[PDB]
Subunit: 170 residues, 7 copies
């Protein structure tokens, strides 16, 4: 009854390091919610990032499932966490007020130099398409370490709407 009603909220929490264990847990939750109904799913994300391949799986699983996914950034959203956040369509990307964002991507993906370049190009294109920023702007910003405030992240094209209450997530 308790977990059953927790499933009824169609909410997924992605808090902490992005790793294969978290990717499995999130994948299971998303597949379970998909099998129940086509109703929208809300994901709250508080993550500093982690492993690139785990971030890739969560990103792709979000786009793969039939239900529309809304994301709500909270606390911080960085690196592989940003990749996950940007899986949702622009109009479905929300933020709580006390959140900072960083698109920096680890070079190794925390592998040869040719693969580091390929990985970077792939992620740069992903972020560019999702935000509406040019490839060159993203390429510069993924290779440095700067935090964006919630308002700056909105101006950047990461966050679409800043919300404080439930009625903003209508």
């Amino acid at each position: 009854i308790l977990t059953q009603k927790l499933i009824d909220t169609r909410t997924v929490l992605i808090y902490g390091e992005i790793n294969q264990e978290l990717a499995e847990d999130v994948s299971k939750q998303l597949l379970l919610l998909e099998s129940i109904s086509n109703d929208p799913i809300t994901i709250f994300i508080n993550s500093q990032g982690g492993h690139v391949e785990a971030g890739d799986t969560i990103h792709d699983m979000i786009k793969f499932i039939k239900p529309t996914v809304k994301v709500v950034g909270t606390g911080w959203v960085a690196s592989a966490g940003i990749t996950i956040y940007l899986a949702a369509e622009k109009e479905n990307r929300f933020s709580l007020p006390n959140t900072r964002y960083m698109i920096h991507q680890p070079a190794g993906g925390v592998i040869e130099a040719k693969e580091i370049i390929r990985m970077r190009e792939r992620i740069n294109r992903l972020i560019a398409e999702a935000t509406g920023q040019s490839y060159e702007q993203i390429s510069k910003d993924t290779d440095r370490n700067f935090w964006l405030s919630v308002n700056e992240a909105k101006d950047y094209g990461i966050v679409n709407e800043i919300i404080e209450n439930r009625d903003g997530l209508k």
Copy 2:
């Protein structure tokens, strides 16, 4: 029946270090209680603080949900714990008698100097608005380590009402 009646009390305990794990647990409890009814929720807080981003999430989740949240400070409330405590509206902020308060915030948030400054400014404004104290007073006090007694915390604008029994939380 046991956990079901524990949920009926609409009570959340925030005891110990503020971290992403605790933030997830608290977020789940708050979302679960919200889905059940719009009835008020009581949070008992005993925390020395912890990670800024986890504190930010809990703070924002308290304000995000529809139910009115009452907070009861107990033992100690410090740093990131203070940020969480101050998420409730002033008239909903209570304290048990044997509690001390400290608004000191860790510089690193336990990151570049520019971001340390930004983080401090954000938290200073948050605490100033919640307490009614000036920005300058808060800015001074977050950058030093001094404990306030329950009575001093009341005079400071952190605690609204000191309670010993159930009837005080009417």
Copy 3:
């Protein structure tokens, strides 16, 4: 059925170190029992003490809840454990025969000198009011390490009644 009938006894055990984890567990049990009925609760305490803030929470939670709380000291009751024990009204403070008591309080509370003094003064006043001893007597005794026998603890005003059987807890 097993834990359900265990809850029917309205008994809470406080055995071992006083820490935030134990404080959370005890808080949950007390709140759960309160929500069921206003019937009295019995707490058996076997503790060497621990963390001051955790002791403060348990002490205050005992006084906060509506049900009358009876305490039964067993084995040993010391330091933060004494603070918890003294939360119950004098006529509700019992002891099993093979128990020793020590009111010694750790200076750091196991923090600046001004806060050590404040903490000590607060706890001294708490113990003085509960036992009926003068502030000066308590102040002397919290700053030294001496064990009281069950009979001496009774004479001191800590224990009200020494009991061996069930009929003594009528």
Copy 4:
């Protein structure tokens, strides 16, 4: 059904080190069995001893509860384990054949010299009253390390009856 029928036997096992964790587990079992009925309880004890305060609690809890407690020594019963064993009335103290007994008590109770003496005097009187031996005999024997065979423990007044089968525990 399995644990429910295990509770129907009204049997408690005290195997291994006497510590606060074991004291809590045993206390819970004894209180649970008491709440069910006033029928006798059988305790099988295999213990080298442990912490004095934990032994004191179990000893006192055995005497505290309404049901009559029978004890069956098995393997070994020593030190704090002896204190627990002697909580039962003499005619309710049994032993399996392959058991050895030692009344040696650790000086520190595994604390000032005055308290070591007080502790020893208290435990000496306890053992003297339970066994029927003089204080002087017990005082000598608690301060040395000698094992008694099951027959010697019977002659000493520790064990009342040596049993091999169920019918002996009638």
Copy 5:
């Protein structure tokens, strides 16, 4: 109801290191799903590889069971993970867009030289048959470390179809 509906999706996740523990878990899931119905099973694979013998078991179990197995590569698929991936028939081999592939096989299988050669020959033949590539091409590529993009893996004969949404897995 929750795990029951999770089983209804007939989905298996192979995330992380390929070891005997994972092989047991996957074997149990595949056998359980087979016993329920002959309906198709979908496996999502995110793995860097691991132990050759565990990979061999999962590969063979996929081919052993009656249900048709579809595989979906996600994040990365390498080494022993590739061996597992290639257990499915070519037309049942899918990939999510953000995935890289590497057919490199560890020489020791992470054992004498004669057995290293035998192992390599066996795996080379397996990969050659599944992909349609010549033995010589596979032999070269398993003995070097190069990552294939999702498009290159498709051209290589590893991936048959790249999918972004549910409708592509019709």
Copy 6:
């Protein structure tokens, strides 16, 4: 249903080191099975031995309970494991074919010299009575390290019947 039918077999497994933890688990199983019915119990023993006092408890508990206990040696049965094995009556002592036996007993019981001698004498008499061997033969053999084959253990009087199939345990 699964553990319920596992209890219906009235089978207890004693595999691995003989310690107080295993003694507690075995004691609980034997008492549970006794409370259900007076039907025979089968114990499979694969043990190198362990702690003497734990072996003594299991030995005595086997003889204490009302149901007839059959033992089946498997793999190896040594030291404290032999003491347990010999708790069953001779005609109820079976062995699987691939089993070796050793009656060697550790001097310390893995304690003063006088107690080492007493312990050895007690165990020697126990083994002599169970096997039908003279005290002198047992005394020699417990103080050396020699393995008996299943056939030699039968000739020694440890094993009564060697069985390969179910029908031999009629």
Copy 7:
């Protein structure tokens, strides 16, 4: 329902190191399946071997129970794993295609020289009888480290039938 239907498959997995813990788990599963019906049991074995006495128990338990046991080798089957594998009758011994076999037995059984010889002779005779190979051939091969391919293991008399699909296990 999930584990209940998993039991309906009458399948046991022996994956990883052969130890007393695994022997207990396998023994419990085999006894449980035997108590349900006399229907055949299938065992999938992926094991490098381990402890001789644990292997002996599993081997003997397979032969002891009434149901006919079929074995399926997968990944690798070596040493103590080979002993277990050979417990099944020749016509019930199957292999998945990607499996290697090694009959090497550790001298110590991973103990005096006389016992090493006895152990080796016992295991040599066991393997000789099961495979149809001469004692001399087995004696040579257990004392060296050489891997057999699935086809070589078939020619050796270890594997009877190589299967790829379900219909081969008819």
